[PDB]
Amino acid sequence: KVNPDGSQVRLKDVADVGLGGQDYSINAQFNGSPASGIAIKLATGANALD
Amino acid sequence: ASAETVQDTVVQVIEQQMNGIDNLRYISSESNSDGSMTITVTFEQGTDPD
Amino acid sequence: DVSSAIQAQNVQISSGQLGGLPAVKGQQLNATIIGKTRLQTAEQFENILL
């Protein structure tokens, strides 16, 4: 918005604004070291080895 | 809508869900100046089109 | 006015989590906060002020 005086108000003046994450819940580590991973389920009919 | 608008407001929103589809060979798409778009999800030979 | 009113005073409010993510270092106690759910009795309806 715009007050009686001055230039203008912005979002910076009411919050922090950087790249975060959609979901902060599920957290992963591979032997302690922070990591991510994707657990893939096999499709009905498909060959595990293939 | 611009090709750019149709790609990022429509074509990509759908594409990000196009998974967990059986016998899925490949997915392609087009976004155009005239506003139109198409996503074509092509399947493995033998798949039941229904 | 009645519809707008009924909509106003009969709406499940989401109401988040008390210790959600991210959180301040420590805390240790996280819990869901259940708001009000929608009206139920005829009497509650007879009371949604206009």
Cα of first residue to Cα of last residue in chain C, in angstroms, is 7
Asked, as a colleague might, if the bond just before C22 is cis with ω within 30 of 0, I would say yes
CB atoms within 10 A of CB B12: 13
Q: How far apart are CA C9 and CA C6, in angstroms?
A: 5
Q: Please report residues of A whose CB lies closer than 8 A to that of C22.
A: 24
Name chain C's partners: 3 or more CB pairs within 8 A: A
Nearest-5° Cα angle at B5, B36 to B39: 45
Q: What resolution, expressed in A, was reported for this entry?
A: 2.9
Three-class DSSP category at B12? helix
Q: Please report residues of B whose CB lies closer than 8 A to that of A47.
A: none
Backbone angles phi, psi at C20, to 5 degrees: -65, -165
Q: Which residues contact C45 (CB under 8 A, 6 or more apart)?
A: C6, C10, C39
Do the Cβ atoms of C35 and C12 come closer than 8 Å? yes
Do the Cβ atoms of C43 and C14 come closer than 8 Å? no
Q: Which residues contact B7 (CB under 8 A, 6 or more apart)?
A: B31, B37
Query: Which residue numbers of A have CB closer than 8 Å to C's CBs?
Result: 24-25
With helix as H, strand as E and coil as C, how does A1-50 read?
Answer: CCCCCCCCCCCCCCCCCCCCCCCCCCCEECCCCEECCCCCCCCCCCCCCC
Q: Please, which experimental method was used?
A: X-ray
